[PDB]
Design a protein around this motif. Structure first.
Motif, PDB file in Angstrom:
ATOM      1  N   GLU A   1       2.086  -0.307  -5.944  1.00  0.00           N
ATOM      2  CA  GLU A   1       1.151   0.809  -6.154  1.00  0.00           C
ATOM      3  C   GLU A   1       1.879   2.226  -6.281  1.00  0.00           C
ATOM      4  OE1 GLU A   1      -1.504   1.437  -2.558  1.00  0.00           O
ATOM      5  OE2 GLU A   1      -2.700   2.817  -3.684  1.00  0.00           O
TER       6      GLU A   1
ATOM      7  N   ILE B   1      -0.934  -1.169  -9.442  1.00  0.00           N
ATOM      8  CA  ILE B   1      -1.896  -0.315  -9.158  1.00  0.00           C
ATOM      9  C   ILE B   1      -1.624   1.288  -9.248  1.00  0.00           C
ATOM     10  CG2 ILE B   1      -3.515   0.129  -7.362  1.00  0.00           C
ATOM     11  CD1 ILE B   1      -3.408  -2.883  -8.090  1.00  0.00           C
TER      12      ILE B   1
ATOM     13  N   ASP C   1      -2.983   4.789  -8.801  1.00  0.00           N
ATOM     14  CA  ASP C   1      -3.923   5.161  -8.064  1.00  0.00           C
ATOM     15  C   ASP C   1      -4.050   6.680  -8.776  1.00  0.00           C
ATOM     16  OD1 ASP C   1      -5.878   5.755  -6.164  1.00  0.00           O
ATOM     17  OD2 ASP C   1      -4.382   5.791  -4.473  1.00  0.00           O
TER      18      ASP C   1
ATOM     19  N   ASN D   1     -12.015  -2.870  -6.450  1.00  0.00           N
ATOM     20  CA  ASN D   1     -11.099  -2.425  -5.265  1.00  0.00           C
ATOM     21  C   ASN D   1     -12.007  -1.935  -4.165  1.00  0.00           C
ATOM     22  OD1 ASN D   1      -8.329  -1.793  -4.914  1.00  0.00           O
ATOM     23  ND2 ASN D   1      -8.900   0.504  -4.632  1.00  0.00           N
TER      24      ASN D   1
ATOM     25  N   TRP E   1      -7.881  -2.893   0.499  1.00  0.00           N
ATOM     26  CA  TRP E   1      -6.751  -1.790   1.115  1.00  0.00           C
ATOM     27  C   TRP E   1      -7.176  -1.321   2.290  1.00  0.00           C
ATOM     28  CZ3 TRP E   1      -8.449   3.208   1.901  1.00  0.00           C
ATOM     29  CH2 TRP E   1      -9.326   3.556   1.201  1.00  0.00           C
TER      30      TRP E   1
ATOM     31  N   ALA F   1      -3.580  -5.233   0.280  1.00  0.00           N
ATOM     32  CA  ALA F   1      -2.714  -4.159   0.407  1.00  0.00           C
ATOM     33  C   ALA F   1      -2.144  -3.771   1.796  1.00  0.00           C
ATOM     34  CB  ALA F   1      -3.154  -3.104  -0.397  1.00  0.00           C
TER      35      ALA F   1
ATOM     36  N   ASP G   1       0.821   6.421  -6.718  1.00  0.00           N
ATOM     37  CA  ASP G   1      -0.160   7.354  -6.728  1.00  0.00           C
ATOM     38  C   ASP G   1       0.219   8.364  -7.695  1.00  0.00           C
ATOM     39  OD1 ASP G   1      -1.337   5.986  -4.728  1.00  0.00           O
ATOM     40  OD2 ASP G   1      -1.282   7.500  -3.177  1.00  0.00           O
TER      41      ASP G   1
ATOM     42  N   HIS H   1       0.655  -1.101   0.061  1.00  0.00           N
ATOM     43  CA  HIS H   1      -0.117   0.044  -0.076  1.00  0.00           C
ATOM     44  C   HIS H   1       0.894   1.317   0.418  1.00  0.00           C
ATOM     45  CE1 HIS H   1      -3.622   2.349   2.193  1.00  0.00           C
ATOM     46  NE2 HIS H   1      -3.070   2.933   0.996  1.00  0.00           N
ATOM     47  N   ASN H   2       0.686   2.019  -1.339  1.00  0.00           N
ATOM     48  CA  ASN H   2       1.545   3.079  -1.449  1.00  0.00           C
ATOM     49  C   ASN H   2       3.036   3.021  -1.070  1.00  0.00           C
ATOM     50  OD1 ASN H   2      -1.012   4.561  -1.698  1.00  0.00           O
ATOM     51  ND2 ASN H   2      -0.687   6.080   0.061  1.00  0.00           N
TER      52      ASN H   2
END
Ligand SMILES: O[C@H]1[C@H](O)[C@@H](O)[C@H](O)[C@@H](O)[C@H]1O
Ligand SMILES: [Ca+2]
Length: 289
Positions: free
Chosen positions: A47, A108, A110, A231, A253, A272, A49, A25-26
């Motif tokens: 991931e 991913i 985002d 998602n 997530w 995630a 962003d 995640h991130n």
């Protein structure tokens, strides 16, 4: 065919939809990994962003996006101020080139702002052109899945039910790109623009059955038919069982205090975590359900 310790060898002959993974995640943020490429020492789902503008209102350029967490340039652990989206994507491309036979990589993407008009050079077409230019033949796309199951790409949503994705072995060396946004409208706009040519799978925010198998909230019926992925936030993770039933790749997530083994038992394909390396089940981060 690769064999890092974290991949259960049973995964290779399993359809991709039958495989559970720990995802980041991130993980583009410096606080979660020293380099973006290092993430691939632990997991195969990452991931990014991405933002159109340097802050919320200014600083964009054509054919270019920034990678950072907050509205505000680039603030991330990718190679490189010129550590932009393209740079982060090239980190993945380069890792792929150095690990022939790798388990398929899922990214991913985002999206944090809306699509531009033609004149600003950040349309859905411009986005596809960037990702195609970087990954070339490495991509596995929605049309590729549709051909595999004998469907039109605009009818993946429902035609995936009862079907198997290609196995991880069939997908060795491949990259799958996934689009997320807080607003499903932006996914609908991408699918209406690109239709069967899309390079990226749309994965809508999912909080009801219609988001898996009907007219998805915030999207047209036409865009809905391209949906092969879903998602979910922590509160909506019960929907993963229906994603699984429809052979859509489900991602959850924000549920970091629940173990990988428990997410497996909840039929979640991609779980995630901020602290991805710390998660495993029986020593594995990738295994059949
Ligand atoms: O903040 C969340 C989170 O970053 C997720 O990983 C992502 O998939 C979403 O689209 C997003 O809104
Ligand atoms: Ca994110």
């Amino acid at each position: 065919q690769e064999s890092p310790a974290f991949i259960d060898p049973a995964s290779w002959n399993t359809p991709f939809n039958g495989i559970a993974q720990v995802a980041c995640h991130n993980c583009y943020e410096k606080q979660y990994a020293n380099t973006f490429s290092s993430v691939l020492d632990s997991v195969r789902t990452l991931e990014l962003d991405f933002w159109d503008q340097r802050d919320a209102v200014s600083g964009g350029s054509p054919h270019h996006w920034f990678v950072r967490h907050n509205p505000g340039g680039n603030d991330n652990n990718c190679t490189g101020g010129k550590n932009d989206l393209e740079a982060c994507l090239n980190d993945v491309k380069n890792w792929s080139d150095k690990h022939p036979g790798h388990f398929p990589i899922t990214l991913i993407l985002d999206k944090k702002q809306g699509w531009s008009k033609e004149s600003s050079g950040r349309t859905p077409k411009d986005f596809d052109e960037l990702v195609a230019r970087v990954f070339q033949g490495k991509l596995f796309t929605p049309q590729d899945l549709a051909t595999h199951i004998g469907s039109g790409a605009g009818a993946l949503q429902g035609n995936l039910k009862g079907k198997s994705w290609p196995t991880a072995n069939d997908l060795q060396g491949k990259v799958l790109l996934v689009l997320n946004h807080s607003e499903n409208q932006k996914l609908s706009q991408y699918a209406e623009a690109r239709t069967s040519k899309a390079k990226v799978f749309i994965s809508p925010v999912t909080n009801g059955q219609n988001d898996i198998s009907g007219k998805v909230s915030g999207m047209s019926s036409q865009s809905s038919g391209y949906v092969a992925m879903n998602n979910m936030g922590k509160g909506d993770k019960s929907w993963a069982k229906q994603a699984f039933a429809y052979s859509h790749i489900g991602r959850v997530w924000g549920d970091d205090e629940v173990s990988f083994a428990q997410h497996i038992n909840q039929k979640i394909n991609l779980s995630a975590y901020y602290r991805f390396a710390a998660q495993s089940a029986g020593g594995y981060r990738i295994r059949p359900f």
